[PDB]
Every structure is written in C-alpha cells, then in structure tokens.
Amino acid sequence: GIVEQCCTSICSLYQLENYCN
Amino acid sequence: GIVEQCCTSICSLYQLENYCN
Amino acid sequence: FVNQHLCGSHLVEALYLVCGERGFFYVPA
Amino acid sequence: VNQHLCGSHLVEALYLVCGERGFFYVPA
C-alpha cells in the first residue's frame, strides 16, 4: 500500500496520485 | 535539470518540489 | 543525507496537495 | 503507471505541486 510504496520506499508522483479519490 | 531528474529518471515528490519558486 | 521518504504527517500532507479537489482516504497504521 | 514525467506532463506536475509559489521550467 502507500506506506510500503512511499514511506519505506521512494514513490513517484503518479504512484502517489493513484491513492486519490 | 528537471528533465534529467523526473523524465529520464524517476523523481520523488521532494525532488519535483525542489523545482518550485 | 536528505530524505526522500514521506512518512506520517508528511504523507498525509502530500496526499492533501496532490489530490486537491479529488480528495483522498487515509489510514495511519 | 509510468513513473516518468515527460514533456507537458512535467509542467503540469509542477503546476500542481508548486501551487502559489509557482515555478521555473526550462527544458534544455
């Protein structure tokens, strides 16, 4: 999920944006 | 530049942001 | 060395920015 | 799913994340 993607690892803008809505 | 960092390569949010102001 | 990781409030706050009008759902664990 | 921000997508990403600071874009 986003923590694994963006906190443990480094995430790109569109990976982040994918968690929107 | 922004093109080496974010297009050729993959930038983090903070790397992208660093190009603001 | 400078940290690229978004954790905690920093991640919420990124979400807040990139999602703008779309909103977002978030759960801190 | 593309990680890479290219071209007019890069300028759009900056539009977004810079908000009221705005930004300087140059391709070179």
Residue numbers in the entry:
A (entry chain A), B (entry chain C): 1 to 21
C (entry chain B): 1 to 29
D (entry chain D): 2 to 29
From the paper:
Because the B24–B29 to B26–B29 shift of the crosslink bridge yielded the high IR-A affinity analogue 8, possible larger gains in receptor affinity upon moving the crosslink further towards the C-terminus of the B-chain were expected and investigated by the B27–B29 (i + 2) cyclization of insulin. Any structural variability observed here is characteristic for all other known insulin oligomers. Therefore, the shortening of the crosslinked sequence and its shift towards the very end of the B-chain in analogue 10 alleviates the conformational stress observed in 2, allowing likely a more effective contribution of the B24–B26 part of the B-chain towards its interaction with IR-A.
Insulin is a small protein hormone composed of chain A (21 residues) and chain B (30 residues), and it exerts its biological effects by binding to the ~340 kDa tyrosine-kinase type insulin receptor (IR). To achieve the stabilization of a specific conformation of the hormone, we developed the strategy of inserting a covalent bridge between specific sites at the B24–B30 C-terminus of the insulin B-chain, i.e., an intramolecular side-chain:side-chain crosslinking. The evidence for the structural impact of the crosslinking in the analogues reported here comes from three crystal (analogues 2, 10, 11) and two NMR (analogues 8, 12) structures.
